[PDB]
């Protein structure tokens, strides 16, 4: 998609192997925010969004938190608390042609900046002056979009880059987990544990708590996890800390 | 510590960086104290037809520790099947040239 009209793909209920992407030699940019790229396969998310678009090389830096510019402000905005990875590669051999590829547009003018993950695809004439345009472009009345006109002979900063942004949502049962192999469930022992991304240390015992069909875990008055629903057996387990005390 | 990398990778020679060089070739610590000095050597380290004497590590099982120097050439396993020293599908030669 064009960056002004970026394409959002929703990913859920699947196994996400992020090492295939990270360990690839084919990407020029792979920057993760709010998460380490080498820990992704140990995590579980409630949703993943893969946002795809084309921008020019020099604009790749704008696809990040805390950035400004024509892309960051008018086309594709990422939040300051963004969690996810921005992956990009040179696509000069795909998205460029002799004479110029004018199928890739970006928004050049807008009344105001975009909100995070806002998608504005309008083509209404932009009023730069004080006089109403009435839909007619001309002096102080601009057509809001412009083409990159990608050419195979352009310098790197003006070559097309295909960008995929993977946003990781952490609300809700986690539905997108890395390719980690599960182990046998062990009770009445002091163990480390990871229940669908929920990690900690303690002793697992059978719970007598009346969990409702939609509830995945519980908390005590300290607002900390004290019970979980086993993601495979749907057994409810109570969590207590391993014996400790002063000496 | 002296070495050759390509222009775009110079930014990777710093604390808090990631990338093929920062992760698999030359890693600097987050508490690094020192100076990173670089200059263009296009008139020394380039030749017509390509200079293939400068290699970098493209694949590795894990990231390097600060000031770790890995010079092995063992085949990298990308898949689940053992390579047994033979490169091919899902089995890569870990180094590549800048040319």
């Amino acid at each position: 998609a064009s960056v002004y009209a970026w394409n959002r793909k929703r990913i859920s209920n699947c196994v996400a192997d992020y090492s295939v992407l990270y360990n690839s030699a084919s990407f020029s940019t792979f920057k993760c925010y709010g998460v380490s790229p080498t820990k992704l396969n140990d995590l579980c998310f409630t949703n993943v969004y893969a946002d795809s678009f084309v921008i020019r090389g020099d604009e790749v830096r704008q696809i990040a938190p805390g950035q400004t510019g024509k892309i960051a402000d008018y086309n594709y905005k990422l939040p300051d608390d963004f969690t996810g990875c921005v992956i990009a590669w040179n696509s000069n051999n795909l998205d460029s042609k002799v004479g110029g590829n004018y199928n890739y547009l970006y928004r050049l003018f807008r009344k105001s900046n975009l909100k995070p993950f806002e998608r504005d695809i309008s083509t209404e004439i932009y009023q730069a002056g004080s006089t109403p345009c009435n839909g007619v472009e001309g002096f102080n009345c601009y057509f809001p979009l412009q083409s990159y006109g990608f050419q195979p002979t352009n310098g790197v900063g003006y070559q097309p880059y295909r960008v995929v942004v993977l946003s990781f949502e952490l609300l809700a049962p986690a539905t997108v987990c890395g390719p980690k192999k599960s182990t046998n469930l062990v009770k009445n022992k002091c163990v480390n544990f990871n229940f669908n991304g929920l990690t900690g240390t303690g002793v697992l015992t059978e719970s007598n708590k009346k969990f409702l069909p939609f509830q995945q875990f519980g908390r005590d008055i300290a607002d900390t996890t004290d019970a979980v629903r086993d993601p495979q057996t749907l057994e409810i387990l109570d969590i207590t800390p391993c014996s400790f005390g002063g000496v | 510590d002296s070495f050759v990398i390509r222009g775009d990778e110079v930014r990777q020679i710093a604390p808090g960086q990631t990338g093929k060089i920062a992760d698999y070739n030359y890693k600097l610590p987050d508490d690094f104290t020192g100076c990173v000095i670089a200059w263009n050597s296009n008139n020394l380290d380039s030749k017509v037809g390509g200079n293939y004497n400068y290699l970098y590590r493209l694949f590795r099982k894990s990231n390097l520790k600060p000031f770790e120097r890995d010079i092995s050439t063992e085949i990298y396993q990308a898949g689940s099947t053992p390579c047994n020293g033979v490169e091919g599908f899902n089995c890569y030669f870990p180094l590549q040239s800048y040319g």
Partner: antibody
Amino acid sequence: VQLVQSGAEVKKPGASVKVSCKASGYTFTGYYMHWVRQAPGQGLEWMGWINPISSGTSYAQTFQGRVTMTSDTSITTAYMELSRLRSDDTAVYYCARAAPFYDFWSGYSYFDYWGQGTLVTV
Amino acid sequence: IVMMQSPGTLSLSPGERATLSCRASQSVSSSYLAWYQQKPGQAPRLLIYGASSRATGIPDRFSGSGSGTDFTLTISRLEPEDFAVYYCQQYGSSAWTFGQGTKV
């Protein structure tokens, strides 16, 4: 991207032939160099490949044991040496470029550049 | 694997459309299917890769499609330079296989 092969050769049965392929316009070690044979009136047959960065090879079972592939990165040239030539090895030999197996978008599955065919008569 | 093209010979006037078929003895990933064009006295050149993607320098008159065991190459309008031998090529099991080729 250009691939330039050696001239035609004429050999007697039992002889060996070495066909070169000089590459230019790209990073030589960034690609696999494949060899493909075409006997007169026949289609294309894949022989094998070499990876110049490590001089690693793989051969089709048809040629394995007869063909040795080598390369020299200093002159960005690949070589294919076919030993124990038989009369049925009369063919046009091509060198062709393909991405390495680590290419994300499967550029290794096909050959994007070809040199001029080199005829070997046996 | 066996890659079988059909018809062995195709003949029609310039300006018209030609369809070239390639069938596999077993399923072939679309990503691993390519088409080549070989003119008389010349080396093969890549036209289509990944079943449908055009190679650089290839006219939009050429297109490909297919999946499983049935792939095709379409030439929407034939020019004098299109009357050559076309091949389908498959990758798998760490080997590259070509069809017998068909002549337009």
